Amino acid sequence: CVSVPVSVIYDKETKTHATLFGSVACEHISSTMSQYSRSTRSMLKRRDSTYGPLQTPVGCVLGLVNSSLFVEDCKLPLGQSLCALPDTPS
Amino acid sequence: VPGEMRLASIAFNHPIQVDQLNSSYFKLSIPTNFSFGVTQEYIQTTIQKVTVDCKQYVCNGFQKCEQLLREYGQFCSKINQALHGANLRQDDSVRNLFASVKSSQSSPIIPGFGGDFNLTLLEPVARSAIEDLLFDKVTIADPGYMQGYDDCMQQGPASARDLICAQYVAGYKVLPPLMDVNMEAAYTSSLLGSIAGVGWTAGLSSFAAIPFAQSIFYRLNGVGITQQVLSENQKLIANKFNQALGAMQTGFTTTNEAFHKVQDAVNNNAQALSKLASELSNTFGAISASIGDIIQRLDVLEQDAQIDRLINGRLTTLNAFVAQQLVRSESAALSAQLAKDKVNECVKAQSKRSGFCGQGTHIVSFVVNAPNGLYFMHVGYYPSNHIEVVSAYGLCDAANPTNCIAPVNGYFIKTNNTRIVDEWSYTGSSFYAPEPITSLNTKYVAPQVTYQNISTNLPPPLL
Amino acid sequence: VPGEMRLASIAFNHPIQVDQLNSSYFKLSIPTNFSFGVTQEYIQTTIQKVTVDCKQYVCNGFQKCEQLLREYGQFCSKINQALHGANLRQDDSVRNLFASVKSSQSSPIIPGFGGDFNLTLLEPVARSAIEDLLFDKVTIADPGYMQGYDDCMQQGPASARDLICAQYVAGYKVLPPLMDVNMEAAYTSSLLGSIAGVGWTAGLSSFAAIPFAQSIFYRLNGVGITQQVLSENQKLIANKFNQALGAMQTGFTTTNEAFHKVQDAVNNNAQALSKLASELSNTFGAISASIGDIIQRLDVLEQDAQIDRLINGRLTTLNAFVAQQLVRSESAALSAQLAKDKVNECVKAQSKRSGFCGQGTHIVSFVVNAPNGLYFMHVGYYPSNHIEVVSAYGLCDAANPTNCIAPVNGYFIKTNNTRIVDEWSYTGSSFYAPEPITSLNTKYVAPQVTYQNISTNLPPPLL
Amino acid sequence: VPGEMRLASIAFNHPIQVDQLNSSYFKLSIPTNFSFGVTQEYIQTTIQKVTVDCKQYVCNGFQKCEQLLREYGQFCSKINQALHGANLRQDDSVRNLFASVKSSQSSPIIPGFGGDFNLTLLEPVARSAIEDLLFDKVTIADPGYMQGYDDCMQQGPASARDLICAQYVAGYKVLPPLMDVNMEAAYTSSLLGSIAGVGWTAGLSSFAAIPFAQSIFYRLNGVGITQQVLSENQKLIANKFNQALGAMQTGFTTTNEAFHKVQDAVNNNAQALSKLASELSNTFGAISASIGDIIQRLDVLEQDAQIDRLINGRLTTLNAFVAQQLVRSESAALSAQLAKDKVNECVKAQSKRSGFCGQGTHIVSFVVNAPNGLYFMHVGYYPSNHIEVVSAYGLCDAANPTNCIAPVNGYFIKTNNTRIVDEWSYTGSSFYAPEPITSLNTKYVAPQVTYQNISTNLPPPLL
Ligand SMILES: *[C@@H]1O[C@H](CO)[C@@H](O[C@@H]2O[C@H](CO)[C@@H](O)[C@H](O)[C@H]2NC(C)=O)[C@H](O)[C@H]1NC(C)=O
Ligand SMILES: *[C@@H]1O[C@H](CO)[C@@H](O[C@@H]2O[C@H](CO)[C@@H](O)[C@H](O)[C@H]2NC(C)=O)[C@H](O)[C@H]1NC(C)=O
Ligand SMILES: *[C@@H]1O[C@H](CO)[C@@H](O[C@@H]2O[C@H](CO)[C@@H](O)[C@H](O)[C@H]2NC(C)=O)[C@H](O)[C@H]1NC(C)=O
Ligand SMILES: *[C@@H]1O[C@H](CO)[C@@H](O[C@@H]2O[C@H](CO)[C@@H](O)[C@H](O)[C@H]2NC(C)=O)[C@H](O)[C@H]1NC(C)=O
Ligand SMILES: *[C@@H]1O[C@H](CO)[C@@H](O[C@@H]2O[C@H](CO)[C@@H](O)[C@H](O)[C@H]2NC(C)=O)[C@H](O)[C@H]1NC(C)=O
Ligand SMILES: *[C@@H]1O[C@H](CO)[C@@H](O[C@@H]2O[C@H](CO)[C@@H](O)[C@H](O)[C@H]2NC(C)=O)[C@H](O)[C@H]1NC(C)=O
Ligand SMILES: *[C@@H]1O[C@H](CO)[C@@H](O[C@@H]2O[C@H](CO)[C@@H](O)[C@H](O)[C@H]2NC(C)=O)[C@H](O)[C@H]1NC(C)=O
Ligand SMILES: *[C@@H]1O[C@H](CO)[C@@H](O[C@@H]2O[C@H](CO)[C@@H](O)[C@H](O)[C@H]2NC(C)=O)[C@H](O)[C@H]1NC(C)=O
Ligand SMILES: *[C@@H]1O[C@H](CO)[C@@H](O[C@@H]2O[C@H](CO)[C@@H](O)[C@H](O)[C@H]2NC(C)=O)[C@H](O)[C@H]1NC(C)=O
Ligand SMILES: *[C@@H]1O[C@H](CO)[C@@H](O[C@@H]2O[C@H](CO)[C@@H](O)[C@H](O)[C@H]2NC(C)=O)[C@H](O)[C@H]1NC(C)=O
Ligand SMILES: *[C@@H]1O[C@H](CO)[C@@H](O[C@@H]2O[C@H](CO)[C@@H](O)[C@H](O)[C@H]2NC(C)=O)[C@H](O)[C@H]1NC(C)=O
Ligand SMILES: *[C@@H]1O[C@H](CO)[C@@H](O[C@@H]2O[C@H](CO)[C@@H](O)[C@H](O)[C@H]2NC(C)=O)[C@H](O)[C@H]1NC(C)=O
Ligand SMILES: *[C@@H]1O[C@H](CO)[C@@H](O)[C@H](O)[C@H]1NC(C)=O
Ligand SMILES: *[C@@H]1O[C@H](CO)[C@@H](O)[C@H](O)[C@H]1NC(C)=O
Ligand SMILES: *[C@@H]1O[C@H](CO)[C@@H](O)[C@H](O)[C@H]1NC(C)=O
Ligand SMILES: *[C@@H]1O[C@H](CO)[C@@H](O)[C@H](O)[C@H]1NC(C)=O
C-alpha cells in the first residue's frame, strides 16, 4: 500500500502551523483526509479550509500562502531554496 | 490577527559586481567607511568528573542483590577503571591548557587600562563582566562539596531536592573542578596583563608594557589602513570599538548561538547523570526496580530471577554511561588543545588567516572562562560604502623607463583628491584616503608594461 | 599466457645526493626545468538527513504490535529526538560553511576569464566541468521529493523499484538537501569572481578585479621564480597550467583515490538505509519477521511472544542506527569546519605551508561541490633537471670589508652564464636563470666571514 | 620516619610585574641570559592490524558449534569485512605519511654532521640514539612471523608462552607492519639529510647542503637575537644546545609524559587482543566456555542450548572488538595527518606560531619513529635574568621633525652601555646587547609624537 508521510511546520511564537505531505504531491491532496494520520486536523482547517494545497519543490503544503518573498532565515527553512515565513504578531 | 505562514525563498544576496577591465589599468573598489563588530564562540573543554560505587548503584543495600551482583563484579571493576582513566585525562587537559595561558611577565592591571577603549572585561575587583554574564545567565546548577550533607540531612531545610542529595542513595559521586575560580581568574588576569602588545617581534622574551589603544592602532596599520587616517580618527575608532564591545551586553541571550552552546555543555552533563539516576527506578523486564519490593512480595525461588534481571539491567546502564563518557572525554581533549592554539594565535597575536574570529581579517580577541569551557570574543572588520576608482599596477618615470615603483600595502590610483595636484595618489588597501605618492608608501621594482608613466611629478624617485 | 605472481620488494627511490662542502662556499642544486601537475582531495561534509516513524517502522500497521510497542514508546522518543538533533547539526554546518564561501564583492564572470589559462571550471551557462564529471561519474541514486509518490503508486510505471518507494512501507523518510544546486552554484560562482586576486594586501576590504593569468604570475614570483623568466615563458607557463588542468579529464575515475572517497560518501549513506530496510525482514529469534504471519499461523498465547521478540529486535536496530548517525554527524561537522579554513587558506589565498595541496609549495587551488561534500583541486610545483653550481652565503666589496650584501629570495652563484662578465650572478630560489647582481635582487647586510669578495664589479654597492 | 600527608595549596607563581608608564617612553623588560631546553610529544599513528577466523574463534573445531554457528554466519562476514576496511585505512595512512617524509634531494650524512652540535640522532651505522632508547625502554612484545611456528610447536623450547602461539588455537592473526625498520629508517635519514636548511626561501626546489650549526644561527637571528651576540657566543650556544639535547638521556623514563604515551599505545593494542583471547574462556550464561565439556557431560537436548549461549556470547565479543577497532583506526588516521603537517611545519621549517613545540618560540625540531607512532623532540627558548630599561617607540632628528626612524626587529633604548657615547642604543627583541643605532638595525618611518628626539648623533639619517 502507499501512504502519505507528514511533517508539521510549527511556530511557538504565533501558535500556528502549516503542513507538508512531501512526495505525495498536491494532485492527491485535499483539506480533508480519509486515510488517516490523527483523529483531528481542525487546527489547520481554521485557515486551510479556504485554500487549495500549494505545490512546492520540497513537498505539497496546506496553509502556505504564495507571497513571492525572499528571506534569509524563517527559522522554519524547508530546505532546498524554500522557507516557511511566520506571520507578524498584531 | 496573524494569518497563515507565507511562501518565501531562501534569499541569496548577490555580491557587488565589479567589472573587469583590459590593458594596464583597473577598477578598484575601495571602502570609504569602516566600522567594527564582534563574533563569538564557545569551546567546551570539560566533562563533569564522575565516580560510581557499583555496590550501591546496582542495589540499595540489599544482600540478595550483593550475592548475585558478586557474579558480575568484574564488570564494575571495568566501569570504575575506565572512568578513572577518563577523569585523569580531564585533569591533564585542564592543567595543560592553563599552563599555556600563564605568562612569565606581565603588566599590572588597574582600572583605566584600555585608555579610550572601554574594556568591560577588566577584573571587577576578580573575573570580568563577561564571566558574570555567562555564569548568571546560564542555568547552571549549584555545586555541593561544602556544606553539603547537612542540607540533605534531616538537620537542614526540608525543601532541599538537590540531585546531589540523591547521590547519597545512588552511590554516585560528583567530583570537584580542578582549578577553582580564583586560579582560573589568575590565569586570565595574566593574559590581560600581556595585552599591549604583540608587536616589536618576539614578545616571547622581552615585554613592552604599552597602552591598549596603541596596540589597536598598530593592528589597524597592520591591515592596510594608513597612519594619517588613524591619527585623525583615533577617537572615532575608540568609539566604534566600544560600540562593537557594547554588543556583548545583549550577546548573553538564548538567541546567541555561542551562548546556546555554553548552555548545552551544561545540559549535556546534567543528562548524563539524570539518565544514571532515572535508570535506578527502571525495571529491566523485572517485576520491580526495587529489591525491597521484590523480596517483600515474592517467594525466594522467584526473587532471585527478578533481582538478576535488575542487576543485569543496572550494569547495562553503567556500560552505556561509561562508553559515552570515554568518547566525550576524548572529544573534550581535542577541543582543549584547539583552544590552546587559539589563545596563542588570536588572543596573544594578530591573525592573518581569515576564516577565524571576526568576519573580516583580525583585530584583538579575548578569552574568558565559561561554564564547562572557554568563551571567546573576536573583534572583526566590516568596511563599507565602497567607491570605484581607476588604479595602476605600478608607476614609472615617463622620462626614464628604468625608474619604476610599486605601492606598499596599498594601491596607486588616479588622483580624484583635490588636495593632490599630482595625477596619481596612494591609498591603503583597507581604506580610501589618497595621499601624495612618496617613498614611505612605495617600493622600487623591476619595470613592467602595466606600470603607468608620470611625466610630471613622482617624488619616488623624483629624478 | 601470464604466469605466477613475482617476488619484488617495495621500492624506495633514494633522493638525489648533494655533497656537503666546507668553508665559505657550497654546492647548490638548482632546478632548470619546471613543470606543473595537480593533486586532489574530497571532503565529505554531509550525512543524508533522516527521520523515522517508529510506529510504522517497528510494525506494518498491526494493532497487536502497537499494543506491545506501547510498552517501549520511550525508546522511539529517544530515537527521533536524537536524530532531530543530528539533522539540525547537519543544517547548521552547511549554512555556516557556505556563509564563509560568499564574497561581499566580486568580478562578473564571462567566458574568456582565464586568459591563456583554460579554466574548464567556469560556469557552463551553472556549475563547472568538474561538477558534472563528479555527478555523472559517481553512482549516486535519483532523488525523490517531486513527483515522488505517483511513480510508487499503481498510477505509474510498474518497473519502479526505488528504495524511496519502499519508504511508504518502512516508515522511513529521506529528507531534502539544505541548499539546492542553484544556491550552491551561486556560492561557488562568488568564489570564482573573487579570483584575481589575493595580492595587494587585505582584499578583505578592496577589490582589484584583475586577470587570472596575472594572479598566476604574481604567485610564481612568490615562490622564488624571477620576473624575467616569467615574462619570457608566459605562454609556456599557460600551456603547462593547461596540461596540469587537463589531467582532471581522467581524474574522475575509480583509480583516483579522491574520487573513490566521493563514491564512498555516497555508499555510506546508502548502507545506512539499506541496513534499516533489511532489518525489517529479519527475525530476532522470532518465528517470523512478519506480524501478519505470526498472527495468521499462531494461537494468541504464542503470538505475543513472537511479536515481542520482533519489536525488541526492531528497536535494537533503531538504536544502533542512531548511535551511528550521531557519530557520523559529528565527524562531518569537523570535516566541514576544516573545509571552511581550507577555502580561506588555499582557494582564497596562496599557501606557504607545504604538506597541503599540490606536492610542491603552492599555486592556485579550486573548490567545487561534490556528492556529499566538497572537492578540491590543487595545482603543485614540480621542478626538475637540477644542476649543481657553487654558491656564496653573501658578497662583499673586496676593497671595502663593510660593504656587504646578501641575495633576496635567491642565491649568489659563481657565474657560469656567458652573458655575464661579472664573476658572480644571481638566481632565484626556485629557478636557474643567472642575472647580473643588482640592487633589485640584493639586500645590504652585516659582514660575515662567508661572504665572498669581489674586487671587480658588484653594482650593489658599486662603490 | 615519615609522618602524615600535609595540607598544601596548589601553587600559582605570579608573573613578573612590569609597571606601565605614560607619555612617550616605557619600561622594557629585556632578558640578559638565554638558555635552551627541550619538550617532547608522541603521536600514535598505528593500531595493530588484525584478522579473525570466526569459525575457529567461536568454537575450537566442534561440529555442533559449526552447525549452530552457521545460523549466525552473516555476523562474522560483517566482522571480517569491517576489519578489512580498517586495516586498509591503516596501510593508506602509513604510506601516505611516509610519502611526505621523503625528500627529492638531500645531503649525505656522515659522522660529524652537526659541527659543534652533538646530534646524537645521527644514524648509528641505521636508526638513532632516540629510537633505540624508545624501543629498548618500552615494554613492547616480540614479533612473530619468522621463525614463528617452530617455537610454538613441540619441536621447540617448552617454555614458549607467546600470545602469538595462542593464535593457532584462537583463530586470531596478528598482521605484519607495513614499512619494516629499514624503510622507516630510509625515510627519516632523508629528513636528516634535508637539515641545513630551511632558509634562502623555497627549498622545495633548490638545495643548499650547508652546516647544521649555521641553520641554528640563522634561526636564532630569526627570533630577534642580533648577529654580534651570536658570533661571540657561538661556542656557548653549541654547548647549551648539547645540554638541552643531553636531557633526552633521562627523557625515556616512566616519569616522562610523552614516554608514557608511547607505552600506552603499546598497552592499548595488547589489551585489544588480550580481551579477545580471555573471552574464549568466558561463559556467557552457559554452563561452560568449552564445547568439548558441554558435549562430554550433557545430553544432546541440553548441549545445543549451552552451545548457542556460547556462540552468541563469542559473537557479541567480536562485535565489541570491531566497533572499537573502527573507532581507533579513524582516530589514528587523524593523528597521522596531523603528524604529516607537523613534519612539514617544525621539522622541515622554523615555527612562528608559539603554543607548539618548545615552550618559547621555535628552534629546530626532530622526528623519530616510535612504538606505534612518531616521537618528536623540540628545542625551546628559555630567556631569563631580565632587566628593566627605558625605551622609545622610535627616534627623530631633533633638528628635523621629518627625519624619523623605528627599530628593526628590536627596540631603541636609552643607552646604559658605556661603550656607546650616543644617548640611544639598539637591542634585539630577544636579547639585551646594546648596539650603536645604525641603518642595519633601523627603518625610516612616518613621524609620530612618541618618537624621541636626538639633537646629537643618530647615523640613521646622520644628516
Ligand atoms: C559611516 O558610518 C557611520 C557609522 O558607522 C555613519 O555615521 C552615523 O550613522 C548613524 C546611523 O543611524 C547616525 O545615526 C549617526 O548620527 C551618524 N553619525 C554622525 C556623526 O552623524 C556615517 O554617516 C557613515 N557614512 C559616511 C562617513 O559617509
Ligand atoms: C563604557 O564604560 C562605562 C564606564 O562607566 C560604562 O558605564 C557603566 O556601566 C555600568 C553597567 O552596570 C554601570 O553600572 C556604571 O554605573 C556605569 N558607569 C557610569 C559612570 O555611569 C559604559 O556602559 C560602557 N559602555 C559600553 C558600551 O559598555
Ligand atoms: C610606461 O612607459 C614604459 C616605457 O618607459 C612602457 O614600457 C613598454 O613595455 C613594453 C613591454 O615589452 C615594450 O615592448 C615597449 O617597447 C616599452 N616601451 C618603451 C618606450 O620602451 C610602458 O608600457 C608604459 N606604461 C603604460 C601603462 O603604457
Ligand atoms: C571624483 O571627483 C569628482 C569631482 O569632484 C566627484 O564628482 C562629484 O561628486 C559629488 C558627490 O556628492 C557630487 O555632488 C558632485 O556634483 C560631483 N561633481 C560633478 C562635476 O559631477 C566624484 O564623485 C569623485 N569620485 C569619487 C569616487 O570620489
Ligand atoms: C623540460 O620539460 C619539457 C616538458 O615539460 C620538455 O619539453 C617537451 O618534452 C616532451 C617529452 O615527450 C616532448 O615530447 C616535447 O616535444 C618537448 N617539448 C619540445 C618543445 O620539444 C623539455 O625538453 C625539458 N627539458 C629542458 C628544457 O631541458
Ligand atoms: C582548452 O579549452 C578548449 C576550449 O575550446 C577545450 O576544447 C573544447 O573541449 C570540449 C570538451 O567537450 C569540446 O566539447 C569543445 O568542442 C572543445 N572546443 C573546441 C573549440 O574544440 C580544450 O579541450 C581545453 N583543454 C584542456 C586540456 O582542457
Ligand atoms: C671577504 O673579505 C673579508 C674582509 O674584507 C673577510 O673577512 C674576514 O673575517 C674574519 C672573521 O673574523 C676576520 O677574522 C678576518 O680578519 C677578516 N678579514 C679581514 C681582511 O679583515 C672575509 O672572510 C672574506 N671572505 C671570504 C669568503 O674569504
Ligand atoms: C658551466 O659552463 C661550462 C662551460 O660552458 C659547461 O660545460 C659545457 O657543457 C655543455 C653541455 O652540453 C657541453 O656540451 C660542453 O662541451 C661543455 N664545455 C666544456 C668545455 O666541456 C657546464 O656544463 C656549465 N655548467 C652548468 C651547471 O651549467
Ligand atoms: C646565565 O646562565 C648560565 C647558565 O645557563 C650561568 O652560568 C653557569 O651557571 C651554573 C649554575 O650552577 C654554574 O654551575 C656554572 O659554573 C656557570 N657557568 C660559568 C661559566 O660559571 C650564568 O651564571 C648565568 N648568568 C649570567 C650570564 O649572568
Ligand atoms: C656528545 O657527543 C659525545 C660523542 O663522543 C658523546 O660521548 C659518547 O657517549 C656515548 C654514550 O654511550 C659513549 O658510548 C661514547 O664512548 C662517548 N664518546 C666518547 C668519545 O667518550 C657525549 O655523551 C655527547 N653528549 C651529550 C650531552 O649527549
Ligand atoms: C620629537 O620632536 C617632534 C618634533 O620634531 C615632536 O613632534 C610633535 O608632535 C605633536 C603631535 O601632534 C605636534 O602637535 C607637535 O607640534 C610636534 N612638535 C613640533 C615641534 O612640531 C615629538 O613629540 C617629539 N618627541 C617627543 C617624545 O617629545
Ligand atoms: C645601568 O648603568 C648603571 C651604571 O653603570 C648600573 O649601575 C651599577 O650596577 C652595578 C651592578 O653590579 C653595581 O655594582 C654598580 O654599583 C651600579 N652603579 C652605581 C653607580 O650604583 C645599572 O645597574 C645599569 N642598569 C642596567 C639595567 O644594566
Ligand atoms: C507563486 O506565484 C508565482 C507567480 O509567478 C508562481 O510562479 C509560483 O510557482 C507560485 N508558487 C506556488 C507554490 O503557488
Ligand atoms: C577592451 O578594450 C577595448 C578597446 O577598444 C574597449 O573598447 C573595451 O571596452 C575593453 N574592455 C573592457 C572590459 O574595458
Ligand atoms: C674540506 O677542506 C679540505 C681542505 O684541504 C678539502 O681537501 C676537503 O675536500 C674539504 N671537504 C669537502 C667536503 O669539500
Ligand atoms: C603619569 O604622568 C605623571 C606626570 O606627573 C607622573 O607623575 C606619573 O608617575 C605617571 N604615571 C606613570 C605610571 O609613570
TrEMBL record, chain A:
Q: Which residues of the full protein are shown?
A: 654 to 743 of 1353
Q: State its location(s).
A: Virion membrane; Host endoplasmic reticulum-Golgi intermediate compartment membrane; Host cell membrane
Protein name (Swiss-Prot/TrEMBL): Spike glycoprotein
Per the entry, what this protein does is: Spike protein S2': Acts as a viral fusion peptide which is unmasked following S2 cleavage occurring upon virus endocytosis. Spike protein S1: attaches the virion to the cell membrane by interacting with host receptor, initiating the infection.
Q: How is it modified after translation?
A: Specific enzymatic cleavages in vivo yield mature proteins. The precursor is processed into S1 and S2 by host cell furin or another cellular protease to yield the mature S1 and S2 proteins. Additionally, a second cleavage leads to the release of a fusion peptide after viral attachment to host cell receptor. The cytoplasmic Cys-rich domain is palmitoylated. Spike glycoprotein is digested within host endosomes.
Subunit structure, briefly?
Homotrimer; each monomer consists of a S1 and a S2 subunit. The resulting peplomers protrude from the virus surface as spikes.
The domain comment in this protein's record states: Fusion peptide 1 (FP1) and fusion peptide 2 (FP2) function cooperatively and have a membrane-ordering effect on lipid headgroups and shallow hydrophobic regions of target bilayers. They are considered as two domains of an extended, bipartite FP. The membrane-ordering activity is calcium-dependent and also dependent on correct folding, which is maintained by an internal disulfide bond in FP2.
Q: Which organism is it from?
A: Middle East respiratory syndrome-related coronavirus
Q: What family does this belong to?
A: Belongs to the betacoronaviruses spike protein family.
The protein's superkingdom reads Viruses
UniProtKB/TrEMBL annotation, chains B, C, D:
Coiled coil ranges (UniProt) are: 263-307
Enumerate the residues marked as the site Cleavage.
Answer: R127, S128
Domain named Coronavirus spike (S) glycoprotein S2 subunit heptad repeat 1 (HR1) region profile: which ranges? Answer: 210-315
Annotated spans, Fusion peptide 1: 128-149
Annotated region Heptad repeat 1: the residues are: 234-284
Name of this chain's protein: Spike protein S2
What is the organism of origin for this protein?
Answer: Middle East respiratory syndrome-related coronavirus (MERS-CoV)
